[PDB]
Amino acid sequence: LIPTVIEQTNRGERAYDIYSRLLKDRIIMLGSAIDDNVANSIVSQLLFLAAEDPEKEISLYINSPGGSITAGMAIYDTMQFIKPKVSTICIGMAASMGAFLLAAGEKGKRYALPNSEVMIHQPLGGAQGQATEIEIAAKRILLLRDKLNKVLAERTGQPLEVIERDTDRDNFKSAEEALEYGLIDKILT
C-alpha cells in the first residue's frame, strides 16, 4: 500500500513509487533482515549509482535487526572498491551487522539520531554430525570471530583486548555512549 508519486521534469507526468524517487537523489534504504536476495540488490544499486557520476556522495539509511555474515561482507567490500564516498545514518535500531556497516562509513560522516540504539555481540552458529565434522565448524567460526574484531579496533580506535571482553554477550548502547566508544562522529538536532 506504499503510495505513488508524480514528477514533472520537462515533459511531466512520470509516475514513480516512493522508493524509486529517493534513488534518483542518491539514497539507498536498508529496512529488512539481511539475506542473500537483499544484498544482491544493494550491490547492484551501488554500482549503478557509481557509473553516471563517479564523484558524488551516497547515503545508506540503516534500520535492521541483523542477519547473515557473508552478505554483510559482500557489502563492506563493495563500499571500499568504488570511488565515491558513502555516509551512514542510524534510524531506530542497528543490530548485529548493521553496526558493522554503520562504523564502516567514511571518517567524519557517521551520523545518528538522539534516541537510537546500537547492539554488538559475537556470532551464533550450529553444528551436527560426527566428531570430525564438528572440529571443522568450530575452527571456522573462531576465524570469523577474530576477523571482525580486527576491523572494529581500527575503525573505532580502541585496542583489541577491550573488544574481545566488551562483547561476550548482548551489549546495548545509546547514541551518546557510542560517541565516546567511537562508533559514530556526530548527533543530529
Binding site: D25, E57, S59, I89, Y111, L188
Partner: peptide, 6 residues
C-alpha cells in the same frame, strides 16, 4: 536529512 546527509 539535510543539512548535511544530503
Amino acid at each position: 536529512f539535510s543539512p548535511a546527509a544530503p
